[PDB]
Amino acid sequence: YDRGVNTFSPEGRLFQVEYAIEAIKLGSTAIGIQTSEGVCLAVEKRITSPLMEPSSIEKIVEIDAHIGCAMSGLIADAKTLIDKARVETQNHWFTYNETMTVESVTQAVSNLALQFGEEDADPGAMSRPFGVALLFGGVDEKGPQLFHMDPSGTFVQCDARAIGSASEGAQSSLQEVYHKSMTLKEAIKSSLIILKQVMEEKLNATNIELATVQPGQNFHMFTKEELEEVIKDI
Amino acid sequence: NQYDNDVTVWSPQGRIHQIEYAMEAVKQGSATVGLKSKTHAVLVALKRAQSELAAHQKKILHVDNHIGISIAGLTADARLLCNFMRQECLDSRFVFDRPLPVSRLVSLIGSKTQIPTQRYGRRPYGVGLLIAGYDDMGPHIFQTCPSANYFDCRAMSIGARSQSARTYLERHMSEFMECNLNELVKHGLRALRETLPAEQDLTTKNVSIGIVGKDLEFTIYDDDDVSPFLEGLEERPQ
Amino acid sequence: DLRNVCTEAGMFAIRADHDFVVQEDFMKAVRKVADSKKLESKLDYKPV
Amino acid sequence: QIHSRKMNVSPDVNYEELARCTDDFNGAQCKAVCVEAGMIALRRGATELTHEDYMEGILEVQAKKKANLQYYA
Amino acid sequence: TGYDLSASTFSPDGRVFQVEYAMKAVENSSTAIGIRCKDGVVFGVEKLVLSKLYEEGSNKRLFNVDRHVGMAVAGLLADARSLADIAREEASNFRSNFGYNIPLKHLADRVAMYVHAYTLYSAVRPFGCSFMLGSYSVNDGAQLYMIDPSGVSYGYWGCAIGKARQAAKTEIEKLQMKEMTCRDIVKEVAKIIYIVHDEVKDKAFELELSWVGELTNGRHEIVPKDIREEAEKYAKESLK
Amino acid sequence: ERGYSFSLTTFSPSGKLVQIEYALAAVAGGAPSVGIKAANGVVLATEKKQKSILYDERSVHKVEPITKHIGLVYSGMGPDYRVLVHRARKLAQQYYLVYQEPIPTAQLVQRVASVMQEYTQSGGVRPFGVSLLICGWNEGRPYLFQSDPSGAYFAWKATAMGKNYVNGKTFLEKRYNEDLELEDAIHTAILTLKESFEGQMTEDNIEVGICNEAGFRRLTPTEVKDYLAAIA
Amino acid sequence: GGDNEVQRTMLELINQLDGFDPRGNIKVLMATNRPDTLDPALMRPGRLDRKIEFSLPDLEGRTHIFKIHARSMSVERDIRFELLARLCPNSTGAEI
Amino acid sequence: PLLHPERFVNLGIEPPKGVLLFGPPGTGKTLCARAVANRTDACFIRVI
Amino acid sequence: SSAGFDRHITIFSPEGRLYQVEYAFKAINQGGLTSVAVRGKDCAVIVTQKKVPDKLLDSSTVTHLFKITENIGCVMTGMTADSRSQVQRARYEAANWKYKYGYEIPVDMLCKRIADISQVYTQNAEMRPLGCCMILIGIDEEQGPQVYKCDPAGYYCGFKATAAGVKQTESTSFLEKKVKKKFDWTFEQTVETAITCLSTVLSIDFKPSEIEVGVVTVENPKFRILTEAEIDAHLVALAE
Ligand SMILES: Nc1ncnc2c1ncn2[C@@H]1O[C@H](COP(=O)(O)OP(=O)(O)OP(=O)(O)O)[C@@H](O)[C@H]1O
Ligand SMILES: [Mg+2]
């Protein structure tokens, strides 16, 4: 009843990777939308006690001056991945002197996913595959770019992604409100509508978080002052 | 069934089950076709996507000016191998200053992937590489498998529901000895059209074509200039 | 087993309609029986 | 070719392919294909059996487990 | 039970089971024959045609390890290729260390010891191929050797491996091979191959032949196309 | 290659090391032996008996001299006794190369027991199967020691290890005392080896070694034949 | 000998369904929890033609089980069970 | 097949004879058997 | 009698035994051969049998005897590959001894070192304890001839007359009864006794093409293999 971490199933799929895929369903939801105007990211927090400090827990964290990341699932381990992303970007800038596309960073990270190996090397990021699901949002020369990365090592560019426990409902409902002539404000409004609809508890200006990136300025996130404008204007 | 937990063990009938399982995993990918003419080699791939608003997964990769590959399986191992291919070709060019012949490279791949299927607690690589290249002896089509075994072929098709396409290739086998690129690629697409159900077919967003030839370097066409190839194709009889 | 050898060497002649045996059929039979006994146990056993 | 002898099979099957698509099937399974593929057609109320029904039957009697998402290729 | 799992545990009756499983793995390969003549040896391989798409000359089962030694294999192709590579490396290493072509009686031993190293520890598995080595030297005569997965190296006047080993070696022994030179041996080999693998089991196949001896200045190589054409034409008459 | 890197002897639910106990049970089935000392020297006696007349008893020995003044005998498994003897020789040389002085017996015993115990906590091995008796004569006072697969060591005045060893202990208690002679020691040791000896006692089936404040020696068959005579 | 008698029982059951003029107009129907231990000769078709499989409910399964097992309740008229379905990832009908 | 024993006989098929139900505990197979027992008309012998 | 993993690895049984070594000894008998060795007054002789089931096999390459050193010979029993490995180990060890100390190795020390090497295998939990037994004959100065035997468990010893194989027990009985005569020994007597012992145990009355003999004498310590002619001479002279 005990097998190594490197076993193939009688139908061809791996065991550990399938289990991690099933495990990322225990995290909070997260929704990302890309528009020619810019990219927007929204996340929940799942506050449990009034002694929570809501500003202490964060999901969106920048990778550089123009790349943002959204995380779901477990959190404790993702710090390593974020760190390697930042170090790689700065190393590339040091060696070559330019800015990298979000695609190159995405695959440069994804090559790190499948490394668990019981035998062989010295201490490795072994034991298990990482349990986090990531959205990458950036603005490069070809406009805004949104990518989705998965524990199996597969990355793909999407237009409207929803990941987390309530992913299915968000994805199902999101198809009927998107098209290519989209604008930033109404995009953010529709995203907020979806989040509030699938929320568990009540909605306020501290239970959610948003961030936006446009070709003009850098990565910028809203605080508790400009966030309620769209809430009252729902 | 305790004979089914590690590479090292041998079944009573003398068939290790891990390798059979890896082959079965390779049969999970999307279809792909490859074939050769007298002086050109063409490989065709059909793509896949999850939701209507997500981009299609890419299949064909660029190895070197005279060598291209197609992939079916899980992608991480695919990248792990492509890096090796690039490294070796660059090394040969740097030292001996000449293109690396395809067969020597394929032998290197076989020797490399054989090692893990023998030690303890090491899995095999799950990929279904199709190699298309041009050398001093002309075109070349090769296929590998997770069992560290490779074959030389003149027309091969792999992936889920690749059997009907293989039968079609077998039927029209001779005429490849006189056709040119214009009709060669049309034959390849005709072959690929059989492995689809009776509701949807080619729409220029699910097709990718790679060509190498005696006087043409390995080129990839996808989603735009593909319409010139596709147009003029007879409809599926019903 | 040797009775069996002497039987098979005749069986190989009942077909091909030879009413006489010749030395090649003994070779055939001996090798044919030689490989069929690879599934007995070959433990001797002893009273004690 | 033996067992499907009675039902009104259309003149379009290609047993030389089906035999190559089956692997490790023993004889009884190769029988069972010929009945499953006879039931599939009646499910859709058609008359003659057709090739695709045989392919469906094959995909049945392997009895492979649920595979959820397919993220390969 | 559970005594047949690893290759480190003896059965109560006193034998290792994994090696026996490997040998049973060998007994499903196609077939190969090799016989010695007055002044050389001749190999012969029959390759089944799995499907029409493959080419002739694919997946060669005859490997020329050195400039003067030939190898024929039966089992799993990948393991055969790896063993061929290690043998070739051993030959080159020996030439560099000392400075002349290695004799058979040493090369076969080195390969045998290296193979036998894969049947003690539990961290590896035994190989799955059985092979034959042949060569000729002007000052050494004609040498033939056969090696199995267990690690046993033996010398033969002529032997055969594969499915129908017994059937083939029935007719191997009838020929008077002590004297007659191996220019007419080739016809005998074609005849002895065409009398096995009935058409009921499979429809069509192809044939490979090799060559070594002072007839070709001791080098080892492949036979010319016309010679095998004549041999096949001749063996077409033996079916009567 | 690579070993296993996890020990095979672990605490049982009642807190008892199973492997070391099984090793002791195996030790109890070896060839019997006895050891005595009295105020002038030390005597070790052990029994050997070849199965058939074909064996050349002149080729192997039980009593092995480590140095000119230290003696060792064993009870239990056959082969690994040689390994332990070799290690003891090596330790003796290593010590002598520092202080230019023969090793005192206590230090030798401590080091050997250290090795024997260390061997039960390493990776992928099983302990030895021997019980050792060590004799020496340094600084006038004679010394006797007995080790154990567990690594514990004791100092005994006279003891017996092997088959039916409890009866040997009782008999020695009923006979041994504090003031004797070397010759009487030899006679009583031979007598207690004859408690359950074989069918007949000869001069080649008994191995006896002595060590006095003059040195350690192994007795030749002539004196063994004489001592077996005028006895029993 | 171990389980020999039970093995003879199993063999008789097997034999009753195959070989020499079978039963004809009789249909069987079986169930189990850990089917990996079933014997190959019993799972061969001609005896167990279909291998229906029951898996853990997905999402319409969970909301629908709630609808069925709670439709005889005196509860509030404005609660949503979809959230309840989301809150329990892999669970059986028993838990509902 | 029991309540419409003409379609299969007319067209020329014989329906299967067995079925196995498996899954983790608590999933609900025994309940399916009860449903079948409630619906039917011919006899029905239960054995454990 | 056992619980846990006593039947799979070399660990102690509850009763004090260990089975993975006791299995190698019965693994010895799988080949089905027997050898006998005798020590004379100033000579040493070894006799073995060889079996060649088919004509295709080259009869000149199945010798079980090997030449370790110009003064020391060995004879093999048991499996094949393990035998070759142990032989190579012995040759290498003797050559290293010669390099290191500058004079020839006595037979006893060599046997001790090979047995000690075997002993480690029964101490760890990764290897198999090499099921093949060893017999050595040599001459030592100031000691005459000497005959030693080494077993898989690591128990080496010097004998006066020994037999290894399927029929060990009855052969030892016969040798004991014969050696009880307590008489002088010469070369002819030694060879005649060694031949007739095996002859009566197997009850064959053989031909000179089935038995191999090795000897060493104190006039020319070079170990040598007897030619078939003088073997026939001994054999016919024995039958009065
Ligand atoms: N689809 C379903 N619809 C309604 N209730 C269900 C469903 N699946 C399971 N249940 C409930 O869960 C329980 C299922 O247990 P049941 O007695 O049927 O056993 P089982 O799952 O068939 O097998 P086992 O006896 O091995 O546990 C029942 O109480 C039933 O009410
Ligand atoms: Mg139940």
Short mmCIF file of N, CA and C in Angstrom, two decimals, chain A residues 66-167:
data_model
loop_
_atom_site.label_atom_id
_atom_site.label_comp_id
_atom_site.label_asym_id
_atom_site.label_seq_id
_atom_site.Cartn_x
_atom_site.Cartn_y
_atom_site.Cartn_z
N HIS A 66 6.64 45.97 -13.36
CA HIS A 66 5.49 45.87 -14.26
C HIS A 66 4.93 44.46 -14.36
N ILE A 67 5.06 43.64 -13.32
CA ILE A 67 4.53 42.28 -13.32
C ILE A 67 3.88 41.99 -11.97
N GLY A 68 2.63 41.54 -12.00
CA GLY A 68 1.90 41.21 -10.79
C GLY A 68 1.47 39.75 -10.78
N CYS A 69 1.30 39.22 -9.58
CA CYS A 69 1.04 37.80 -9.37
C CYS A 69 -0.14 37.61 -8.43
N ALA A 70 -1.00 36.64 -8.74
CA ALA A 70 -2.13 36.27 -7.89
C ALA A 70 -2.02 34.80 -7.53
N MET A 71 -2.19 34.47 -6.26
CA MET A 71 -1.92 33.14 -5.74
C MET A 71 -3.16 32.52 -5.11
N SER A 72 -3.33 31.22 -5.29
CA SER A 72 -4.41 30.51 -4.62
C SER A 72 -3.95 29.12 -4.20
N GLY A 73 -4.65 28.58 -3.21
CA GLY A 73 -4.32 27.27 -2.66
C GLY A 73 -3.59 27.40 -1.33
N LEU A 74 -2.52 26.63 -1.16
CA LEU A 74 -1.65 26.88 -0.03
C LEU A 74 -0.87 28.16 -0.27
N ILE A 75 -0.30 28.70 0.80
CA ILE A 75 0.44 29.95 0.64
C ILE A 75 1.86 29.78 1.13
N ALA A 76 2.05 28.96 2.16
CA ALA A 76 3.31 28.95 2.88
C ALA A 76 4.49 28.70 1.95
N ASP A 77 4.31 27.83 0.96
CA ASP A 77 5.40 27.44 0.09
C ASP A 77 5.62 28.38 -1.09
N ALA A 78 4.61 29.14 -1.51
CA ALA A 78 4.75 29.94 -2.71
C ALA A 78 5.86 30.98 -2.60
N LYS A 79 6.28 31.31 -1.38
CA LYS A 79 7.31 32.32 -1.21
C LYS A 79 8.57 31.96 -1.99
N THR A 80 8.92 30.68 -2.03
CA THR A 80 10.09 30.26 -2.78
C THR A 80 9.94 30.60 -4.26
N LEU A 81 8.79 30.28 -4.83
CA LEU A 81 8.57 30.55 -6.25
C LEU A 81 8.64 32.03 -6.54
N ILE A 82 7.98 32.85 -5.72
CA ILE A 82 8.04 34.29 -5.94
C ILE A 82 9.47 34.79 -5.86
N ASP A 83 10.24 34.27 -4.91
CA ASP A 83 11.62 34.71 -4.76
C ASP A 83 12.43 34.37 -6.01
N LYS A 84 12.31 33.14 -6.50
CA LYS A 84 13.05 32.78 -7.70
C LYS A 84 12.64 33.63 -8.89
N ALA A 85 11.35 33.97 -8.98
CA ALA A 85 10.92 34.85 -10.06
C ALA A 85 11.64 36.19 -10.01
N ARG A 86 11.63 36.82 -8.84
CA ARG A 86 12.26 38.14 -8.73
C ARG A 86 13.75 38.06 -9.02
N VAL A 87 14.43 37.06 -8.46
CA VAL A 87 15.87 36.95 -8.66
C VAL A 87 16.18 36.75 -10.13
N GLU A 88 15.38 35.94 -10.82
CA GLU A 88 15.62 35.73 -12.24
C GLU A 88 15.45 37.02 -13.03
N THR A 89 14.40 37.78 -12.73
CA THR A 89 14.20 39.02 -13.47
C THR A 89 15.38 39.96 -13.29
N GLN A 90 15.82 40.14 -12.05
CA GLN A 90 16.93 41.05 -11.82
C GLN A 90 18.22 40.53 -12.45
N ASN A 91 18.44 39.22 -12.41
CA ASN A 91 19.62 38.66 -13.05
C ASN A 91 19.60 38.93 -14.54
N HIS A 92 18.44 38.77 -15.17
CA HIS A 92 18.34 39.04 -16.60
C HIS A 92 18.61 40.50 -16.89
N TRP A 93 18.05 41.40 -16.09
CA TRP A 93 18.32 42.82 -16.32
C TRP A 93 19.80 43.13 -16.15
N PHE A 94 20.44 42.53 -15.15
CA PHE A 94 21.86 42.78 -14.94
C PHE A 94 22.68 42.29 -16.12
N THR A 95 22.37 41.12 -16.63
CA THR A 95 23.22 40.54 -17.66
C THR A 95 22.98 41.19 -19.01
N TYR A 96 21.73 41.46 -19.37
CA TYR A 96 21.42 41.89 -20.72
C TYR A 96 20.95 43.34 -20.83
N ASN A 97 20.43 43.93 -19.75
CA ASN A 97 19.96 45.31 -19.74
C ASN A 97 18.72 45.52 -20.59
N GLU A 98 17.62 44.86 -20.23
CA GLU A 98 16.29 45.22 -20.72
C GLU A 98 15.26 44.58 -19.79
N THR A 99 13.99 44.70 -20.16
CA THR A 99 12.89 44.10 -19.42
C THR A 99 12.39 42.87 -20.15
N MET A 100 11.98 41.85 -19.39
CA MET A 100 11.59 40.57 -19.97
C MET A 100 10.09 40.48 -20.13
N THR A 101 9.67 39.66 -21.09
CA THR A 101 8.26 39.40 -21.28
C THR A 101 7.74 38.50 -20.17
N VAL A 102 6.46 38.67 -19.84
CA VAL A 102 5.85 37.82 -18.82
C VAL A 102 5.86 36.36 -19.26
N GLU A 103 5.87 36.11 -20.56
CA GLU A 103 5.92 34.73 -21.03
C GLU A 103 7.24 34.07 -20.66
N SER A 104 8.35 34.77 -20.89
CA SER A 104 9.64 34.18 -20.59
C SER A 104 9.76 33.90 -19.10
N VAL A 105 9.32 34.84 -18.27
CA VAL A 105 9.33 34.61 -16.83
C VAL A 105 8.44 33.43 -16.47
N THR A 106 7.28 33.33 -17.12
CA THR A 106 6.35 32.26 -16.80
C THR A 106 7.00 30.91 -17.02
N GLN A 107 7.60 30.70 -18.19
CA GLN A 107 8.16 29.38 -18.43
C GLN A 107 9.45 29.18 -17.64
N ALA A 108 10.20 30.25 -17.40
CA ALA A 108 11.39 30.12 -16.57
C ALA A 108 11.04 29.64 -15.18
N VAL A 109 9.89 30.07 -14.66
CA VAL A 109 9.41 29.54 -13.39
C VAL A 109 8.90 28.12 -13.56
N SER A 110 8.10 27.88 -14.60
CA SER A 110 7.42 26.59 -14.73
C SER A 110 8.41 25.45 -14.87
N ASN A 111 9.58 25.70 -15.43
CA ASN A 111 10.57 24.63 -15.50
C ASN A 111 10.99 24.14 -14.13
N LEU A 112 10.62 24.83 -13.06
CA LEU A 112 11.02 24.44 -11.73
C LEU A 112 10.03 23.49 -11.07
N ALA A 113 8.87 23.26 -11.68
CA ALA A 113 7.78 22.57 -10.99
C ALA A 113 8.10 21.11 -10.71
N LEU A 114 8.52 20.36 -11.73
CA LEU A 114 8.71 18.92 -11.59
C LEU A 114 10.15 18.63 -11.22
N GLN A 115 10.42 18.58 -9.92
CA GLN A 115 11.76 18.33 -9.42
C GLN A 115 11.82 17.30 -8.32
N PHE A 116 10.71 16.96 -7.68
CA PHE A 116 10.73 15.98 -6.60
C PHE A 116 11.35 14.68 -7.06
N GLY A 117 12.44 14.30 -6.41
CA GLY A 117 13.11 13.05 -6.70
C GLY A 117 13.64 12.39 -5.45
N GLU A 118 13.02 11.28 -5.06
CA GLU A 118 13.35 10.66 -3.78
C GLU A 118 14.83 10.35 -3.67
N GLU A 119 15.41 9.76 -4.70
CA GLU A 119 16.82 9.37 -4.66
C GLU A 119 17.68 10.50 -5.23
N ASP A 120 18.89 10.15 -5.69
CA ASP A 120 19.81 11.03 -6.40
C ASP A 120 20.43 12.13 -5.55
N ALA A 121 20.23 13.38 -6.00
CA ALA A 121 20.91 14.58 -5.52
C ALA A 121 20.96 14.82 -4.01
N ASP A 122 21.46 16.00 -3.65
CA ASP A 122 21.59 16.51 -2.29
C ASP A 122 20.23 17.11 -1.95
N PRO A 123 20.06 17.94 -0.88
CA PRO A 123 18.72 18.46 -0.62
C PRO A 123 18.10 19.12 -1.84
N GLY A 124 16.93 18.63 -2.22
CA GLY A 124 16.20 19.13 -3.36
C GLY A 124 14.86 19.63 -2.90
N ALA A 125 14.17 20.46 -3.68
CA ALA A 125 12.81 20.85 -3.34
C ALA A 125 11.91 19.65 -3.65
N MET A 126 12.29 18.56 -3.00
CA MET A 126 11.74 17.23 -3.18
C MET A 126 10.38 17.04 -2.56
N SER A 127 10.17 15.82 -2.10
CA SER A 127 9.04 15.48 -1.26
C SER A 127 7.71 15.57 -2.00
N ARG A 128 7.39 16.72 -2.58
CA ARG A 128 6.06 16.86 -3.15
C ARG A 128 6.07 18.01 -4.14
N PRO A 129 5.15 18.01 -5.09
CA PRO A 129 4.98 19.17 -5.95
C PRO A 129 4.31 20.29 -5.17
N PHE A 130 4.58 21.52 -5.58
CA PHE A 130 4.01 22.67 -4.90
C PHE A 130 2.50 22.71 -5.12
N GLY A 131 1.79 23.28 -4.15
CA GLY A 131 0.35 23.24 -4.19
C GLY A 131 -0.38 24.51 -4.60
N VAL A 132 0.29 25.45 -5.24
CA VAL A 132 -0.30 26.76 -5.51
C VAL A 132 -0.67 26.88 -6.98
N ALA A 133 -1.68 27.70 -7.25
CA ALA A 133 -2.07 28.06 -8.60
C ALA A 133 -1.86 29.55 -8.80
N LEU A 134 -1.28 29.94 -9.94
CA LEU A 134 -0.82 31.30 -10.12
C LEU A 134 -1.43 31.95 -11.35
N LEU A 135 -1.74 33.23 -11.23
CA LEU A 135 -2.06 34.09 -12.35
C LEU A 135 -0.97 35.14 -12.48
N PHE A 136 -0.47 35.32 -13.69
CA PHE A 136 0.56 36.31 -13.97
C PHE A 136 -0.01 37.39 -14.87
N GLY A 137 0.13 38.64 -14.46
CA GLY A 137 -0.37 39.73 -15.26
C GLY A 137 0.68 40.79 -15.50
N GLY A 138 0.89 41.15 -16.76
CA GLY A 138 1.91 42.12 -17.08
C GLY A 138 1.52 42.91 -18.30
N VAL A 139 2.31 43.94 -18.58
CA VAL A 139 2.14 44.73 -19.79
C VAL A 139 3.48 44.78 -20.49
N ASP A 140 3.53 44.23 -21.70
CA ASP A 140 4.73 44.27 -22.50
C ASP A 140 4.45 44.97 -23.83
N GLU A 141 5.45 44.91 -24.71
CA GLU A 141 5.38 45.59 -26.00
C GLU A 141 4.15 45.19 -26.81
N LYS A 142 3.65 43.97 -26.64
CA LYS A 142 2.47 43.54 -27.38
C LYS A 142 1.19 43.73 -26.57
N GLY A 143 1.18 44.70 -25.67
CA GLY A 143 -0.01 45.06 -24.95
C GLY A 143 -0.06 44.38 -23.60
N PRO A 144 -1.26 44.17 -23.10
CA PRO A 144 -1.43 43.44 -21.84
C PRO A 144 -1.40 41.94 -22.06
N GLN A 145 -0.84 41.24 -21.07
CA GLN A 145 -0.67 39.80 -21.16
C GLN A 145 -1.09 39.16 -19.84
N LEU A 146 -1.87 38.10 -19.93
CA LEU A 146 -2.32 37.35 -18.77
C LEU A 146 -2.05 35.87 -18.99
N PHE A 147 -1.39 35.24 -18.02
CA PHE A 147 -1.03 33.84 -18.11
C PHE A 147 -1.53 33.10 -16.88
N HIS A 148 -1.76 31.80 -17.03
CA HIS A 148 -2.19 30.96 -15.92
C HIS A 148 -1.25 29.77 -15.81
N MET A 149 -0.73 29.54 -14.60
CA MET A 149 0.18 28.43 -14.34
C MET A 149 -0.37 27.55 -13.23
N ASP A 150 -0.09 26.25 -13.36
CA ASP A 150 -0.73 25.12 -12.72
C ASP A 150 0.32 24.20 -12.11
N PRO A 151 -0.01 23.44 -11.06
CA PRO A 151 1.00 22.59 -10.41
C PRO A 151 1.66 21.57 -11.32
N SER A 152 1.02 21.17 -12.41
CA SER A 152 1.61 20.17 -13.29
C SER A 152 2.78 20.70 -14.12
N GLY A 153 2.97 22.01 -14.18
CA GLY A 153 4.00 22.58 -15.02
C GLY A 153 3.52 23.15 -16.34
N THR A 154 2.21 23.23 -16.55
CA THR A 154 1.64 23.71 -17.79
C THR A 154 1.20 25.15 -17.63
N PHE A 155 1.56 26.01 -18.59
CA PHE A 155 1.14 27.40 -18.56
C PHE A 155 0.47 27.77 -19.87
N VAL A 156 -0.55 28.62 -19.79
CA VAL A 156 -1.27 29.01 -21.00
C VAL A 156 -1.86 30.40 -20.82
N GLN A 157 -1.89 31.16 -21.91
CA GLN A 157 -2.46 32.50 -21.90
C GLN A 157 -3.97 32.45 -22.02
N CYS A 158 -4.66 33.17 -21.15
CA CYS A 158 -6.12 33.19 -21.14
C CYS A 158 -6.61 34.62 -21.20
N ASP A 159 -7.92 34.77 -21.38
CA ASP A 159 -8.56 36.08 -21.39
C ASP A 159 -9.33 36.39 -20.13
N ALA A 160 -9.96 35.40 -19.51
CA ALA A 160 -10.72 35.62 -18.29
C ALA A 160 -10.58 34.36 -17.46
N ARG A 161 -9.80 34.43 -16.39
CA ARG A 161 -9.51 33.24 -15.61
C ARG A 161 -10.11 33.36 -14.22
N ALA A 162 -10.56 32.22 -13.68
CA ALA A 162 -11.07 32.16 -12.32
C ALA A 162 -10.54 30.90 -11.67
N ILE A 163 -9.83 31.05 -10.56
CA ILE A 163 -9.23 29.89 -9.91
C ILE A 163 -9.57 29.91 -8.43
N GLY A 164 -9.75 28.73 -7.86
CA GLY A 164 -10.03 28.64 -6.45
C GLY A 164 -11.15 27.67 -6.20
N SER A 165 -11.74 27.75 -5.01
CA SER A 165 -12.81 26.83 -4.66
C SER A 165 -14.04 27.05 -5.53
N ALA A 166 -14.41 28.30 -5.77
CA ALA A 166 -15.60 28.60 -6.55
C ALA A 166 -15.29 28.84 -8.01
N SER A 167 -14.28 28.16 -8.53
CA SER A 167 -13.81 28.47 -9.88
C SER A 167 -14.87 28.15 -10.92
#
